[PDB]
Amino acid sequence: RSIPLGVIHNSALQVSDVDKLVCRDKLSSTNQLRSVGLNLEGNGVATDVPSATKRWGFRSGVPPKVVNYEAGEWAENCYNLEIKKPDGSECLPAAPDGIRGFPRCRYVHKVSGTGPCAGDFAFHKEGAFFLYDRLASTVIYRGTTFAEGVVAFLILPQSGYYSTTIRYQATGFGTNETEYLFEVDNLTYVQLESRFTPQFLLQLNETIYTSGKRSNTTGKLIWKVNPEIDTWAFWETELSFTVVXXXXXX
Amino acid sequence: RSIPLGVIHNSALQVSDVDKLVCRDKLSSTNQLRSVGLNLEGNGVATDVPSATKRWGFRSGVPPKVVNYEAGEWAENCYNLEIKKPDGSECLPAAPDGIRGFPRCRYVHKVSGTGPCAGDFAFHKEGAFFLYDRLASTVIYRGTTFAEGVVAFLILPQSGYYSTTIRYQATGFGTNETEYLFEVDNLTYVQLESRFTPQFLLQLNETIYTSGKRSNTTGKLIWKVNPEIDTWAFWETELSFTVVXXXXXX
Amino acid sequence: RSIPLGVIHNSALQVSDVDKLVCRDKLSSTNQLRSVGLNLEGNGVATDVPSATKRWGFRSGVPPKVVNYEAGEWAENCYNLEIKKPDGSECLPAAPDGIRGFPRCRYVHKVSGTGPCAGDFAFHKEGAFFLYDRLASTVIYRGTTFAEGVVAFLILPQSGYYSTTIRYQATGFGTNETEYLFEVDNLTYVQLESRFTPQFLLQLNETIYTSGKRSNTTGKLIWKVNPEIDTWAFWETELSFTVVXXXXXX
Amino acid sequence: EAIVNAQPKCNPNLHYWTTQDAAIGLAWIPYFGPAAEGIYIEGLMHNQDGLICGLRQLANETTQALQLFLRATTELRTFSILNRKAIDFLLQRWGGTCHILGPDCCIEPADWTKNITDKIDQIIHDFVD
Amino acid sequence: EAIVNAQPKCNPNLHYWTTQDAAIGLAWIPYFGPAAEGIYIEGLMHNQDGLICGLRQLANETTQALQLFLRATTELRTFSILNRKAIDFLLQRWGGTCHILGPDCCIEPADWTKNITDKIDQIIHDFVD
Amino acid sequence: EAIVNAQPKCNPNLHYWTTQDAAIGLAWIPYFGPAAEGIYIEGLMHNQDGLICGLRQLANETTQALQLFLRATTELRTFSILNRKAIDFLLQRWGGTCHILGPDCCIEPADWTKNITDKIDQIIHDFVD
Numbered sequence A, B, C: 001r002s003i004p005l006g007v008i009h010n011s012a013l014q015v016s017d018v019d020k021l022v023c024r025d026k027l028s029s030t031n032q033l034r035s036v037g038l039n040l041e042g043n044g045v046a047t048d049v050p051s052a053t054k055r056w057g058f059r060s061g062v063p064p065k066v067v068n069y070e071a072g073e074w075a076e077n078c079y080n081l082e083i084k085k086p087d088g089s090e091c092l093p094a095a096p097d098g099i100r101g102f103p104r105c106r107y108v109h110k111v112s113g114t115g116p117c118a119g120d121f122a123f124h125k126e127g128a129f130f131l132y133d134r135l136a137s138t139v140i141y142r143g144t145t146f147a148e149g150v151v152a153f154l155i156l157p158q159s160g161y162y163s164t165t166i167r168y169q170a171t172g173f174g175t176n177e178t179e180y181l182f183e184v185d186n187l188t189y190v191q192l193e194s195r196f197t198p199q200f201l202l203q204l205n206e207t208i209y210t211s212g213k214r215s216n217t218t219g220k221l222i223w224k225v226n227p228e229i230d231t232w233a234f235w236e237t238e239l240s241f242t243v244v245x246x247x248x249x250x
Numbered sequence D, E, F: 001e002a003i004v005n006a007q008p009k010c011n012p013n014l015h016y017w018t019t020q021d022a023a024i025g026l027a028w029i030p031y032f033g034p035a036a037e038g039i040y041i042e043g044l045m046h047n048q049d050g051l052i053c054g055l056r057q058l059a060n061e062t063t064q065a066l067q068l069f070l071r072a073t074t075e076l077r078t079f080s081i082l083n084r085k086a087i088d089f090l091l092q093r094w095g096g097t098c099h100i101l102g103p104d105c106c107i108e109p110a111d112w113t114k115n116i117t118d119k120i121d122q123i124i125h126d127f128v129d
């Protein structure tokens, strides 16, 4: 169909197009035409890595497509994927020339791991876009920070920045049997669940470091949080460790 | 010069431009502006591989150029070239990103073989374009199906699909001493001539298979059609085999 | 800010924009809109290789940018750089597809050599552009002839070509300790200074050849011009050789 | 000028394809939608008003100006041919002062004429004392 | 039509970034200027007139037509969406003859009316002999 | 504002090249035509009205706004600077209702004035009974 256009009439936003304005409507400069990228975050979608990755999938036969946008929204959750196949080959294409990561991310969820990747490109299952630096794509690029979102086109009428990288390891990526681990260091991991917020993950990381709960050997140590530990949208808001290489954090 | 524009006046198509319309002429939407690709087939050109390849040639010093077009014509004959030099290097460049083959071809004449290729790019000797998927180029891309054609620009006023690949082998491609063979299988070939239609080639292929005229050894078998066998444009329309490794099909 | 536009009013060129014209101003065709590239040469900048290279520098974190221009100025001095790091890696990126050298150069100063190249891209320190074939860039491309210049945008109202390549060798390129040698042949060089004009370099080359002052061994011979030898802008205009492997040309 | 088909033959029918396709459910989502081979619609145009044979000759005659345009542009071209045609169309009509009742001004004061000369009968008809 | 936000939630505030930034000295020179991370300005818009929650629903509803547009175009696209919208806007108003006092003609002869009917009192008032 | 050349020198002559070239035979065919080095025409402009020295200063002063424009755009830019200037020109004149005899409306009702006040002598002159 024809691409809709947002215009302000009667102190309210309305969808319209250039062919259904009235002579009273005045477009005197291209400066009144604006493209904006809005994050799925703002609509109330679950942003944890298990929930977010379920919205993406691999498909072949569909070429990727790209559209510009001028202004974007500060994101709390972004994602940066480094996925390989079990044979070692890359699942995602390198970012084309001039495609930089999404510029404003409070938490960048960097996910490394493996999966079958039964498809040439990773698309958004719900039809949304992957928002990069002033560029929206239909597919995910390797190692490039993105926010999920959608684009609107408008006719206008005539605060420090901090980013924290949260690293994960993944097995069976893409399938319906995907497993995630939160990486404390290269040998200490926490089995991840959907209910863990970014703030809880950063405090669990600070607790493990200061309490000496990191692995002090050459082997891999994986902690499990017991379900008895728990603590809305992002905008509206005594631990015992014993080893059982699994373990439990009560 | 200035690019001409097709406009309908007095129940007839006329060439004009936006600077020589009258106030009666009404262009109220970019939807009235259309680019169309027309196939040389429709003008009555010989479409057989020997005749068609004579219209192409290699030249250096001229960069390739590309133009978009929105609508195209169903083609009976398309071409897909895989040519190398005797030293093994490729004669034609890989198709740029996002250039797919021509989307509607009844017969794709796939030509593999060798030639000197005295030139960086292969151009159309008569100035025509090579039509790909909604993209017209001045040069041929490697292994990419194209139809020869030309582009028109218009101001508008306010049926199953089957494709058959016909494979050829070529020596001396580009020169005036080019030889072509129609490939029945990897060891059975027919010496090609200009008068062989696609329908005749497919029936000759079906006859050779069912009659057991394929090579039953490890060597190469080449059939020749005797001139006594024969049978307009595409839109207006008891065999004896003995071996003489050449042979004859009477 | 907004990109200024040149318009002719009262028999003089004025800076303006499309939003501050009067109804008397008539723009009836895009043919009246023109982009032009003007060479820094025309403003009186020193064009010798030592002076010119001081205006360029390496910087990281800034992506390169490119803008089209339609008409350009014949240049007396152009530059073509082939710089490597001491480890052998290239300092400058290969020219993108379709970027050809500046088309009109009386003297192409080809500079080969080494330097630290502390930066991903080489920019113009004074904010000017590097002019290629109808394309202006913010960065220098490897082995691609360019002229320094700037771009203007205009609203219009409703002689053989010879090029000479002058080759140089450079050490410490980019730093404030750069050394240049004018190459007579692969074993005979002249220590370069800012005051040497292209015409003086070509006559010094012709004198060295005809007088047999080229190196007649396998080693490297470097001539020095004594300061007693000397001879405005480009548009307004008995030698003794003894060896001292240095030497002097009096 | 008119279009004179000077080709050896003309196929009078245009069996064409394009991508100018209300979607069916989730078919608009690229992950669920058609492959690249299945985005085309087809149509068949006949030679009414000789438009097809004229179109074939028009595309043939467009080539020289099109090739000369492509030679003069760099493959980093940043403008479309048809959008520039649309802009030139508007600049031809409205790029200068529109003198009403002029040959180059596309303003018809028809109803405005029979709104003044119609409503003269409000001052000449009401001339009583 | 109007915009009906049908999302599970709405963040009523838009903390946005853009690159629509008088330069400070030599900061405009790319060699001396900011890195790619430092070219952004920030702003905060609140939900006055419900514009933010309407904008989120608008971007959501734009996706289908946007995806269908991207499927039909080749990634060698040579035209911008917003420039084509601007051209279509002008073609809608001025692509044909503007009939004064018509519904599709954006010409107001207001002052021109009270310049004729005002200056009738130069010929009907001066009718003396 | 005016253009004040503040450069150390000015070359008052512009020896220029461009590609704005009736073709000779088959020279338009890329296979037979010129190489990339031979597509240029040359010209020589002198400093009449000081246009050349003004042009050199204009290009110099354009750089800051041009660089700031290039910093804010992504190298996937899909619009041309000059086409957008042409669109903005039309939007400035015709982006709203044109009030006749206004300062921002480029409509001259000159002949339309002396077509009404001329043809008043068809009703005031024909007032006989």
Ligand SMILES: CN1[C@@H]2CC[C@H]1C[C@@H](OC(c1ccccc1)c1ccccc1)C2
Pocket (backbone or CB within 6 Å): A034, A070, A071, E018, E020, E021, E041, E042, E043
């Ligand atoms: C400091 N910013 C503020 C005001 C000027 C500068 C640029 C930015 O612009 C906003 C804006 C919107 C409406 C009116 C004025 C400024 C803006 C947001 C998105 C896209 C473009 C501009 C916000």
Ligand SMILES: CN1[C@@H]2CC[C@H]1C[C@@H](OC(c1ccccc1)c1ccccc1)C2
Pocket (backbone or CB within 6 Å): B034, B070, B071, D018, D020, D021, D041, D042, D043
């Ligand atoms: C089903 N098709 C048919 C009619 C709508 C759909 C789209 C296609 O459009 C034609 C067309 C031409 C003139 C009027 C209406 C439709 C078409 C051909 C080439 C380029 C664009 C559109 C033909």
Ligand SMILES: CN1[C@@H]2CC[C@H]1C[C@@H](OC(c1ccccc1)c1ccccc1)C2
Pocket (backbone or CB within 6 Å): C034, C070, C071, F018, F020, F021, F041, F042, F043
């Ligand atoms: C032979 N040249 C001469 C005149 C026609 C041909 C093309 C070139 O055009 C000039 C020009 C400028 C103003 C009026 C007429 C021609 C020109 C220079 C720069 C960019 C475009 C055109 C100069």
Ligand SMILES: CN1[C@@H]2CC[C@H]1C[C@@H](OC(c1ccccc1)c1ccccc1)C2
Pocket (backbone or CB within 6 Å): B006, B013, B034, B036, B071, B154, B156, B157, D014, D016, D045, D051, D052, D055
């Ligand atoms: C109303 N339509 C009908 C007849 C004229 C107008 C335009 C359309 O045909 C177009 C066309 C363009 C591209 C592909 C297929 C049809 C057309 C315009 C001019 C000349 C021939 C066909 C069908």
Ligand SMILES: CN1[C@@H]2CC[C@H]1C[C@@H](OC(c1ccccc1)c1ccccc1)C2
Pocket (backbone or CB within 6 Å): A006, A013, A034, A036, A071, A154, A156, A157, E014, E016, E045, E051, E052, E055
């Ligand atoms: C006057 N401005 C004020 C309020 C309406 C007009 C436009 C601007 O807000 C824009 C906007 C666009 C992109 C980023 C940030 C603000 C806007 C337009 C429509 C709906 C919501 C916001 C602020």
Ligand SMILES: CN1[C@@H]2CC[C@H]1C[C@@H](OC(c1ccccc1)c1ccccc1)C2
Pocket (backbone or CB within 6 Å): C006, C013, C034, C036, C071, C154, C156, C157, F014, F016, F045, F051, F052, F055
């Ligand atoms: C009528 N022409 C004559 C004089 C003004 C008009 C424009 C043309 O010169 C152009 C020009 C542009 C690019 C290359 C060469 C010439 C021109 C416009 C403004 C200022 C200087 C020259 C020559």
Ligand SMILES: *[C@@H]1O[C@H](CO)[C@@H](O)[C@H](O)[C@H]1NC(C)=O
Pocket (backbone or CB within 6 Å): A126, A127, A128, A129, A150, E006, E007, E008, E060, E061, E063
């Ligand atoms: C738009 O919103 C609806 C309802 O929340 C949702 O089902 C749909 O997936 C959204 N579309 C996109 C492209 O995100």
Ligand SMILES: *[C@@H]1O[C@H](CO)[C@@H](O)[C@H](O)[C@H]1NC(C)=O
Pocket (backbone or CB within 6 Å): A176, A177
């Ligand atoms: C989910 O995973 C199970 C493996 O336990 C598999 O049998 C099933 O087919 C999967 N479902 C889908 C929809 O892929």
Ligand SMILES: *[C@@H]1O[C@H](CO)[C@@H](O)[C@H](O)[C@H]1NC(C)=O
Pocket (backbone or CB within 6 Å): A186
């Ligand atoms: C952790 O592992 C990564 C992946 O091999 C490696 O790049 C990094 O240097 C390691 N860090 C430490 C502290 O060992």
Ligand SMILES: *[C@@H]1O[C@H](CO)[C@@H](O)[C@H](O)[C@H]1NC(C)=O
Pocket (backbone or CB within 6 Å): A164, A165, A166, A167, A202, A205, A206, A209
């Ligand atoms: C985890 O805590 C350590 C201890 O300060 C810190 O260095 C590290 O950055 C933290 N990790 C994250 C992801 O914040």
Ligand SMILES: *[C@@H]1O[C@H](CO)[C@@H](O)[C@H](O)[C@H]1NC(C)=O
Pocket (backbone or CB within 6 Å): A211, A212, A213, A214, A215, A216, A221, A241, A243
């Ligand atoms: C050594 O590592 C274990 C985890 O395996 C950790 O809990 C323990 O605190 C470390 N050692 C000491 C003495 O704390």
Ligand SMILES: *[C@@H]1O[C@H](CO)[C@@H](O)[C@H](O)[C@H]1NC(C)=O
Pocket (backbone or CB within 6 Å): B126, B127, B128, B129, B150, D006, D007, D008, D060, D061, D063
């Ligand atoms: C156009 O038609 C003429 C006559 O059939 C032919 O000679 C010429 O080569 C054609 N041009 C192209 C570009 O095909």
Ligand SMILES: *[C@@H]1O[C@H](CO)[C@@H](O)[C@H](O)[C@H]1NC(C)=O
Pocket (backbone or CB within 6 Å): B176, B177
């Ligand atoms: C055609 O081929 C013959 C070889 O038999 C050669 O002598 C002749 O030069 C060729 N003609 C052309 C035009 O290349």
Ligand SMILES: *[C@@H]1O[C@H](CO)[C@@H](O)[C@H](O)[C@H]1NC(C)=O
Pocket (backbone or CB within 6 Å): B186
């Ligand atoms: C025929 O030869 C081609 C080219 O090497 C090869 O790819 C193909 O597999 C062969 N087919 C058979 C049936 O041998």
Ligand SMILES: *[C@@H]1O[C@H](CO)[C@@H](O)[C@H](O)[C@H]1NC(C)=O
Pocket (backbone or CB within 6 Å): B164, B165, B166, B167, B202, B205, B206, B209
């Ligand atoms: C030739 O005939 C065989 C026998 O059915 C068939 O498999 C093959 O596809 C045919 N080749 C072509 C090019 O149609």
Ligand SMILES: *[C@@H]1O[C@H](CO)[C@@H](O)[C@H](O)[C@H]1NC(C)=O
Pocket (backbone or CB within 6 Å): B211, B212, B213, B214, B215, B216, B221, B241, B243
């Ligand atoms: C074996 O191959 C020949 C061709 O060389 C073929 O004509 C013949 O039919 C085959 N053998 C038999 C018994 O048919």
